[PDB]
Design an enzyme around this catalytic site. Structure first.
Site, PDB file in Angstrom:
ATOM      1  N   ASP A  94       0.841  -1.204   0.000  1.00 45.54           N
ATOM      2  CA  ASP A  94       0.000   0.000   0.000  1.00 45.54           C
ATOM      3  C   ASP A  94       0.874   1.252   0.000  1.00 45.54           C
ATOM      4  O   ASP A  94       0.594   2.209   0.729  1.00 45.54           O
ATOM      5  CB  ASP A  94      -0.941  -0.021   1.214  1.00 45.54           C
ATOM      6  N   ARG A 100       0.077   9.168   0.856  1.00 48.70           N
ATOM      7  CA  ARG A 100      -0.850   9.256   1.994  1.00 48.70           C
ATOM      8  C   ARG A 100      -0.435   8.327   3.169  1.00 48.70           C
ATOM      9  O   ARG A 100      -0.869   8.543   4.299  1.00 48.70           O
ATOM     10  CB  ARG A 100      -2.301   8.926   1.561  1.00 48.70           C
ATOM     11  N   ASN A 101       0.409   7.310   2.882  1.00 49.87           N
ATOM     12  CA  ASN A 101       0.917   6.327   3.823  1.00 49.87           C
ATOM     13  C   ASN A 101       2.384   6.580   4.251  1.00 49.87           C
ATOM     14  O   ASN A 101       3.043   5.701   4.811  1.00 49.87           O
ATOM     15  CB  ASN A 101       0.702   4.929   3.257  1.00 49.87           C
ATOM     16  N   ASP A 155       1.849   2.807   7.847  1.00 53.41           N
ATOM     17  CA  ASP A 155       0.635   2.100   7.431  1.00 53.41           C
ATOM     18  C   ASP A 155       0.919   0.698   6.865  1.00 53.41           C
ATOM     19  O   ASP A 155       0.567   0.405   5.718  1.00 53.41           O
ATOM     20  CB  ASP A 155      -0.221   2.930   6.458  1.00 53.41           C
TER      21      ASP A 155
HETATM   22  C1  LIG Z   1      -4.369  14.864  10.807  1.00 51.11           C
HETATM   23  N1  LIG Z   1      -3.209  14.238  11.431  1.00 51.11           N
HETATM   24  C2  LIG Z   1      -2.923  12.929  11.488  1.00 51.11           C
HETATM   25  C3  LIG Z   1      -1.754  12.812  12.172  1.00 51.11           C
HETATM   26  N2  LIG Z   1      -0.963  11.696  12.518  1.00 51.11           N
HETATM   27  C4  LIG Z   1      -1.096  10.391  12.008  1.00 51.11           C
HETATM   28  N3  LIG Z   1      -1.990  10.194  11.025  1.00 51.11           N
HETATM   29  C5  LIG Z   1      -2.017   8.987  10.447  1.00 51.11           C
HETATM   30  C6  LIG Z   1      -1.168   7.937  10.831  1.00 51.11           C
HETATM   31  C7  LIG Z   1      -1.161   6.592  10.146  1.00 51.11           C
HETATM   32  C8  LIG Z   1      -1.619   5.359  10.967  1.00 51.11           C
HETATM   33  N4  LIG Z   1      -0.229   4.872  10.953  1.00 51.11           N
HETATM   34  C9  LIG Z   1       0.184   3.612  10.942  1.00 51.11           C
HETATM   35  N5  LIG Z   1       1.384   3.189  10.667  1.00 51.11           N
HETATM   36  C10 LIG Z   1       1.324   1.829  10.957  1.00 51.11           C
HETATM   37  C11 LIG Z   1       2.292   0.828  10.918  1.00 51.11           C
HETATM   38  C12 LIG Z   1       1.951  -0.454  11.329  1.00 51.11           C
HETATM   39  C13 LIG Z   1       0.656  -0.730  11.774  1.00 51.11           C
HETATM   40  O1  LIG Z   1       0.243  -1.994  12.130  1.00 51.11           O
HETATM   41  C14 LIG Z   1       1.176  -3.072  11.985  1.00 51.11           C
HETATM   42  C15 LIG Z   1       0.705  -4.278  12.770  1.00 51.11           C
HETATM   43  C16 LIG Z   1      -0.118  -5.287  11.974  1.00 51.11           C
HETATM   44  C17 LIG Z   1       0.563  -5.655  10.664  1.00 51.11           C
HETATM   45  C18 LIG Z   1      -0.408  -6.533  12.795  1.00 51.11           C
HETATM   46  O2  LIG Z   1      -1.376  -4.653  11.682  1.00 51.11           O
HETATM   47  C19 LIG Z   1      -0.314   0.264  11.819  1.00 51.11           C
HETATM   48  C20 LIG Z   1       0.055   1.520  11.395  1.00 51.11           C
HETATM   49  O3  LIG Z   1      -0.702   2.672  11.376  1.00 51.11           O
HETATM   50  C21 LIG Z   1       0.267   5.930  10.059  1.00 51.11           C
HETATM   51  N6  LIG Z   1      -0.304   8.130  11.839  1.00 51.11           N
HETATM   52  C22 LIG Z   1      -0.254   9.331  12.437  1.00 51.11           C
HETATM   53  C23 LIG Z   1       0.740   9.470  13.570  1.00 51.11           C
HETATM   54  N7  LIG Z   1       1.618   8.477  13.711  1.00 51.11           N
HETATM   55  O4  LIG Z   1       0.718  10.464  14.319  1.00 51.11           O
HETATM   56  C24 LIG Z   1      -1.402  14.126  12.507  1.00 51.11           C
HETATM   57  N8  LIG Z   1      -2.283  15.001  12.050  1.00 51.11           N
HETATM   58 CL   LIG Z   2      -2.121   0.362   8.562  1.00 48.39          CL
END
Ligand SMILES: Cn1cc(Nc2ncc(C3CN(c4nc5ccc(OCCC(C)(C)O)cc5o4)C3)nc2C(N)=O)cn1
Ligand SMILES: [Cl-]
Ligand SMILES: [Cl-]
Ligand SMILES: [Cl-]
Ligand SMILES: [Cl-]
Length: 277
Positions: A138, A142-143, A156
């Site tokens: 993915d 955006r990720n 993500d």
């Molecule tokens: C408006 N606005 C938004 C923010 N900050 C954010 N916005 C969006 C995200 C996405 C959600 N993230 C994300 N990376 C990931 C890596 C791994 C994971 O799972 C792995 C385990 C398994 C495979 C078992 O699923 C899940 C994940 O989710 C990036 N993050 C922030 C942040 N970190 O602050 C500030 N202002």
């Molecule tokens: Cl994710």
């Protein structure tokens, strides 16, 4: 539930805040001391054993690279629902950042060398994941997240896959992935290789170079496979260096074996950036 790698964080230590995106939420995590820490919380009909979600999260918690987001842990809350705990990144995702920069109030007009450095950051994070046999599946602007120091990290990984590992319970979500980032050979049956990520990396580079434009203006999602089958590709963005456009185009060669690796792309982008005044 068994947690042999000790990746679970006590649910009582987490206080959920506002919705950051749609889901992703802001949160506060109480540390060993009286201190509170700002964190992000990601929450995602036949399901696999929760123990395997925890094992996958534990493996990602051991990722150590400046251009790869590092998972803090998982909180379980009730049917148990896992929630991924991440470092809070106030600047948010790269795609929205690029769009905001085209506004007077947003970040200043991004210099060409800062755009190239964002691409180097992503290729470095992808080279690290690729070398560890991880398929992102993915990859898109955006990720990718912007750290407080303006460096980019790939993030993500919710739908990622370690090569050879089980994947049955992600198939339903993989079938719904946005079509404009998927390699021509991966469109027919949604089967990914490291070269599928290379294709998506070329699309991500084009998103950075256009400052957040949606790939393929004038082409609708349902026409995408036939469009690529006819040999059509993303067009060169205005003021995109010819050398940079050729690096992007090499990511979209019909035969996946003809596309370069992330190590080659990364070196090519570092050399291009070094050659600029
Ligand atoms: C408006 N606005 C938004 C923010 N900050 C954010 N916005 C969006 C995200 C996405 C959600 N993230 C994300 N990376 C990931 C890596 C791994 C994971 O799972 C792995 C385990 C398994 C495979 C078992 O699923 C899940 C994940 O989710 C990036 N993050 C922030 C942040 N970190 O602050 C500030 N202002
Ligand atoms: Cl994710
Ligand atoms: Cl499987
Ligand atoms: Cl796959
Ligand atoms: Cl285009």
């Amino acid at each position: 539930a068994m947690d042999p790698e000790d990746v679970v964080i006590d649910r009582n230590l987490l206080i959920l805040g506002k919705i950051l995106g749609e889901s992703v939420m802001e949160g506060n995590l109480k540390q060993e001391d009286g201190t509170s820490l700002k964190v992000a919380v990601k929450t995602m009909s036949s399901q696999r054993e929760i123990e395997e979600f925890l094992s996958e999260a534990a493996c990602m918690k051991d990722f150590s690279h400046p251009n790869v987001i590092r998972l803090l842990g998982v909180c379980i809350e009730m049917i148990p629902k896992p929630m991924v705990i991440l470092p809070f990144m106030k600047y948010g995702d790269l795609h929205t950042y690029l769009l905001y920069s085209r506004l007077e109030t947003g970040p200043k007009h991004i210099p060409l060398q800062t755009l190239l450095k964002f691409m180097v950051d992503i290729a470095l994070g992808m080279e690290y994941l690729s070398n560890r046999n991880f398929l992102h599946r993915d990859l898109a602007a955006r990720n990718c997240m912007l750290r407080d120091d303006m460096t980019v990290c790939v993030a993500d990984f919710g739908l990622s896959k370690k090569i050879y590992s089980g994947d049955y319970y992600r198939q339903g979500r993989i079938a719904k992935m946005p079509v404009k980032w998927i390699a021509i050979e991966s469109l027919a049956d949604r089967v990914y290789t490291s070269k599928s990520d290379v294709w998506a990396f070329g699309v991500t580079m084009w998103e950075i170079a256009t400052r957040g434009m949606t790939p393929y203006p004038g082409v609708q999602n349902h026409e995408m496979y036939d469009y690529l089958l006819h040999g059509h590709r993303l067009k060169q963005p205005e003021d995109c260096l010819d050398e940079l456009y050729e690096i992007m185009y090499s990511c979209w060669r019909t035969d996946p074996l003809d596309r370069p690796t992330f190590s080659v792309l990364r070196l090519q982008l570092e050399k291009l950036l070094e050659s600029l005044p």
